[PDB]
Design a protein around this nucleic acid. Structure first.
Ligand SMILES: [Mg+2]
Ligand SMILES: [Mg+2]
Ligand SMILES: [Mg+2]
Ligand SMILES: [Mg+2]
Ligand SMILES: [Mg+2]
Ligand SMILES: [Mg+2]
Ligand SMILES: [Mg+2]
Ligand SMILES: [Mg+2]
Ligand SMILES: [Mg+2]
Ligand SMILES: [Mg+2]
Ligand SMILES: [Mg+2]
Ligand SMILES: [Mg+2]
Lengths: 260, 180, 71
RNA sequence: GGAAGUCGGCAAAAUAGAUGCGUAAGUUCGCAAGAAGCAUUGGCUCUGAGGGCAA
RNA sequence: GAUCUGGUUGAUUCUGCCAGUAGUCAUAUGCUUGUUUCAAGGACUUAGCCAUGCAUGCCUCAGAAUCACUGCAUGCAGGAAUCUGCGCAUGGCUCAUUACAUCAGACGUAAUCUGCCGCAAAAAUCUUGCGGCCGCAAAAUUGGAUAACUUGGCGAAACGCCAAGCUAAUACAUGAACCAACCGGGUGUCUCCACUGAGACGCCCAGCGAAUGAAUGACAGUAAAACCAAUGCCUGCAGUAACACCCAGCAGUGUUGACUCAAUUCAUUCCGCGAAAGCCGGCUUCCGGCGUCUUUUGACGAACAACUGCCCUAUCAGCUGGUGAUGGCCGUGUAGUGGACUGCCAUGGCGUUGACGGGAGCGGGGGAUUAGGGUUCGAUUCCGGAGAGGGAGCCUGAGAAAUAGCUACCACUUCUACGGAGGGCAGCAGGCGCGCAAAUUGCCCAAUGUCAAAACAAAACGAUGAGGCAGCGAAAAGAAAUAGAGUUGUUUCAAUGGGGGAUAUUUAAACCCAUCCCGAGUAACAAUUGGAGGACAAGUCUGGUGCCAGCACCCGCGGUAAUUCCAGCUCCAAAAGCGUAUAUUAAUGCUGUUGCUGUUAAAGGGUUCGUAGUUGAACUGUGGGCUGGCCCUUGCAGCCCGUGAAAGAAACAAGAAACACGGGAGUGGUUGCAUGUCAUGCAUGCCGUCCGUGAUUUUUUACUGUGACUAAAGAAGCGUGACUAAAGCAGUCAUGACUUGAAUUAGAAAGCAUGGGAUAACAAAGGAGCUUUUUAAAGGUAUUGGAGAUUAUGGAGCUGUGCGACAAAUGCUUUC
């Protein structure tokens, strides 16, 4: 019955300093996993600087001023995660939670039209009472009548304002994906082939836009479009292209010299 | 109290395990029901998670199925006749899963007459039903005698019920010879 | 593994032999392990034969594997 | 109460059958050994094991 | 920096130890200490004993106020107190137990349970009012009891108690017809057909969840045709999802590597399931926030299992054993698997690759030292485990074998009016003992978190010894004062801190730092600790003592001329520090895998036989031809890539070839005219592969190259003028931008995918248990409209006859 979280044990992506407190906020159970989420207090106090401390974070959150997936959330320990839509109407800000090329959490600005939909990955399919097929999603959603072509690897385009599915994208050989876990998290690539090893982890081989090869486990890929040029979601600035470490350092040095 | 852990057992090498922790509630056991034949009496038991187990102390009625006809009936239990663990359980008349009992055969006779028109309206569906259908002589002999053998299929100490199925086929002959 | 003993009823003992590396003396030493495996009447293994086994739920105090194929 | 009696535990008391478990020093390896010691046992109603010769 | 020196001889060259030397967030003690930053701190011995105080509670607009409570004029509130709901199983402390236990990396639960949080689901139920069981109607206006309180109190007291009287609910109990559907099973009276079939009608019974029984939970080895009875469609077999009307397409199609799983229908049986019979708000209605029962899946957890690894000891060699030891069968118990446990059966399981027993130890991340290989430490911040004086037992609860919960015994112990009643600091401060050995009975919830009936504010401030702040503190680590510049043969010049104060700044409030002024000439604002024969830097100095006193880590000094003792002077080393003791790393190739010795220095067994173990000979194997007289460098391309033999046949390819699957491929991959119209038919058409299933036959392990999967803190290091640095992850520049940054790496072994075949390992064998193809004949499932039966004809294999063609790694026109 754990209800605390030491700061040294908290995920590195939250970017909390080791010298400014013994504890970190422990996320509650919810739509996303504890190790793969970002609590609302961290979003509002760190990252965005609307709150200077936890006292001001509680004032903002308990008034219902922050909407996640078109619903007010009043808990600072609420776990927010991949592809969630966060809107603060009083300020007039809209973001989506994504992974940048370095694997860190990134907030991508959205237009009003783009804020109405989110991509949902199927993780299970079962039959409910009365012979009703149900699809379970990577964020804990349960869809009561999915498209008859839905499979466990597919992606569903979901309108959150009307609570209705609009489109289905299948996991095939010629589709574009983004990596959600492992050493390649945040990279955008194209499927080349999938290796099936029954009873163990399937392995996917992918190709980057620059021709670089990399592989991950099949449970870490997320379909986002029919090819590398027609993506159904907006991605961060770097477009999921890993850059050479030697080259990246050289450009940063040159930019510093010119800026000064 | 009673425990179900492996700490007190010997190792396969014959050595002794040195225990360095106290007993935990998550590994308990409880005393057996020892269900007997008699007027109904049960006792509820609060198990892990808040759910309730029904511990039956005495039972005399149950729900018994005729598998060939895919039907069932509620009948009175008369005796315990055989038990594979030991015959001291037959002497005390203890009810457990997979023991052989004798039940009342009157409700099954009534269903046969009303479904096939056979004693052991214009629309005669009976002629259709008797077509390509036959009954075993071993069963019909008991149905006329009044009592018929059956096998308990439920666990009375876990659910509080004594349900079962009638013996047919080669399993009936197996237990008839063991009783002879 | 290889079959070591077949004296019990519907259960056998198998042996797995392997080499273990010692870093300080850059050399190996022989080691082995023993397991109890349930054998179904579909197979008739003999001492010295090689089998393929698969993990299952606990079936006794020591048995955690089942024979799947005899070579 | 328990050898204070008496030269001296003389005399008396005391132990006790059968079955299971268990058993020291010493030793010519045979013993010491029933070492010492612990436990069970009635009556009644039942259940199992241990055979023969006739096809 | 991959380093050595003194001591055995009258001299020499060795072996070998003793002594010297440098580190330690590594402890303790001695002498000393001006400034500032950063920090460990009753672990070692006694998981010893504890006075006193404090450490866990929670109320919004939104569950219950008639305080005989408080203001102000009927509405408020600190609304006291109580009932109700949630929490108190987390955090904090400690390391006593412990070696197939725990733990690390990697995995399983298809063997299970799971409050709070997320997304969802819901059609069972005869109730109420009036009138006389019936009839008429519908916004169902449901019932009883208990606290706080009042009265009488008992008791020396007790986080001790009794009786009576009042009264709330989101406490407890009861309970809702018609509105209101689809679908099915069993059975009686009416119409019709035929001589059975169809349709009414009645009559039952059909919700979620649980139990037992019966079906479904697909197919994916052959094709043409007759004959019966019942049916469909045409006027005899074309055309054809299925189905006797209201519905002419209202499921012929769940998931997985795999399921007795998901879900559905039938029979019988439970005997847990409110629309809180709830609370607020905005506008007569309408709308919106909460709150709660049951069902089902994610998430957060719990419990179980074990693939590889995990100290010393043989003056510990056998251990276990139906008395549960290893396994089997039917049961019981559990949330669930299981000798976990009852009954019966069989005789197994483990061990020199070290079982069993004994001893010292909580396990990791990691620390010290080190050219490399190594040696050693890890009570202690993060993760895992275990405990609350000892030992058992248990209730509540989603979760405890809970201890600032209960029950008992043992050892200690407190109060008493003697009747009785209490206690558990290995939480924070403190105290006693123990010791070589370790702080204040301080301030605060401002920050970081946790709980919760809860934003903040307004009459109107939740708790928190977790946590933070300061006091003590030469454990350890950074930066740094004790002066500087000059003129003549002892006299001047500026400068600044320590310190003392500030309009002030910092801070929850204080303190420290930072900023700024009245202040140095024995700048008395006065530096120490060890040494001066050698190792080892530095005195033939001057007195005293006289093998005494004493020094001396070792070698050695001292017996009246002491380079060594006690002193003065002068010098040396490190310096706000420097000695001593005990452990430990290097020095140490004096533990030797890299890397030691064994004739005489310590050490080859008296000689052989022999089992585990270690080690073990050669061989299957130059590819070739053409471009820029053999051979070799290069760059080219293309080869059946020895030899045969031109779609097949040689060689390969289980990663491959044979079979079949429309429920295989986003619709069956690639190379306005017709069909239907009762139509939401609003429909339909204009050679290589993919996927499932069957048949056929075979190669690992190991090493090596990549790749995947792998908590921080710590180590390495990319950037950055916190004034530098030890640090930290920040910050930089002109109603904001940098679409700011916070890169990257290594981490044993075991586990996962793949490609490469040289050196090797495992297993098998022990060489006499060792033909193909093409036609003729004899014998013995699928298509016929669909569904159920009987029937020939054929496919194919089983075989015994003839015939054609081609091979053969060993001559049949042959041998005997
Ligand atoms: Mg006596
Ligand atoms: Mg006497
Ligand atoms: Mg006398
Ligand atoms: Mg006598
Ligand atoms: Mg005796
Ligand atoms: Mg309460
Ligand atoms: Mg079983
Ligand atoms: Mg160690
Ligand atoms: Mg004791
Ligand atoms: Mg204390
Ligand atoms: Mg001197
Ligand atoms: Mg002198």
């Amino acid at each position: 019955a754990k209800k605390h979280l030491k700061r040294l044990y908290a995920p590195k992506d939250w970017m909390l300093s080791k010298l400014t407190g013994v504890f970190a906020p422990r996320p509650r159970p919810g739509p996303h996993k504890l190790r793969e989420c970002l609590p609302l207090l961290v979003i509002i106090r760190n990252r965005l600087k609307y709150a200077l401390n936890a006292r001001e974070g509680e004032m903002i959150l308990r008034q219902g001023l922050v909407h996640v997936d078109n619903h007010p959330r009043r808990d600072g320990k609420y776990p927010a995660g991949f592809m969630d839509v966060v809107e603060i109407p009083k300020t007039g800000d809209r973001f989506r939670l994504m992974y940048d090329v370095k694997g860190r959490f990134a907030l991508v600005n959205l237009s009003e039209a783009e804020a109405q939909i989110k991509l949902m990955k199927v993780v299970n399919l079962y039959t409910a009472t009365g012979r009703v097929p149900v699809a379970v999603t990577h964020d804990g959603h349960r869809i009561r009548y999915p498209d008859p072509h839905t499979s466990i690897g597919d992606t569903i385009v979901y309108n959150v304002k009307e609570k209705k599915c609009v489109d289905l994208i299948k996991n095939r050989q010629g589709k574009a994906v983004i990596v959600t876990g492992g050493a390649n998290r945040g990279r955008i690539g194209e499927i080349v082939k999938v290796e099936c090893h029954p009873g163990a982890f399937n392995i996917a081989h992918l190709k980057d836009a620059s021709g670089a090869e990399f592989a991950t486990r099949a449970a870490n890929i997320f379909v986002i479009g029919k090819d590398l040029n027609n993506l159904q979601v907006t991605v961060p600035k770097q477009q999921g292209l890993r850059m050479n470490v030697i080259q990246e350092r050289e450009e940063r040095l040159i930019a510093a010299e010119a800026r000064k | 109290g009673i425990v179900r852990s492996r700490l007190h057992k010997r190792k396969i090498t014959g050595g002794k395990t040195k225990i360095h922790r106290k007993r935990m509630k998550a590994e308990l056991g409880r005393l057996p029901a020892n269900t007997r034949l008699g007027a109904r009496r049960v006792s509820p038991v609060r198990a892990r998670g808040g759910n309730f187990k029904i511990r039956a102390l005495r039972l005399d009625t149950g729900n018994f199925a005729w598998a060939s006809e895919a039907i069932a009936h509620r009948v009175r239990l008369l005796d315990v006749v055989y038990n594979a663990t030991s015959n001291e359980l037959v002497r005390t008349k203890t009810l457990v899963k997979n023991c052989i009992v004798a039940v009342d055969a009157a409700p099954f006779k009534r269903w046969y007459a009303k479904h096939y028109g056979i004693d052991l309206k214009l629309q005669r569906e009976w002629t259709r039903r008797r077509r390509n259908h036959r009954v075993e002589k071993a069963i019909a002999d008991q149905l006329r005698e009044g009592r018929v053998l059956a096998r308990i299929t439920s666990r009375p100490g876990q659910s509080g019920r004594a349900d079962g199925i009638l013996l047919e086929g080669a399993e009936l002959q197996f237990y008839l010879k063991r009783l002879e | 593994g290889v079959v070591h003993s077949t004296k019990m009823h519907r259960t056998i003992i198998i042996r797995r032999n392997y080499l273990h590396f010692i870093k300080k003396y850059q050399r190996y030493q022989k080691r082995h392990k023993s397991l109890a495996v349930h054998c179904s009447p579909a197979f008739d293994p003999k001492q010295g034969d090689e089998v393929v086994i698969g993990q299952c739920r606990p079936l006794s105090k020591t048995i955690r594997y089942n024979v799947l194929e005899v070579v």
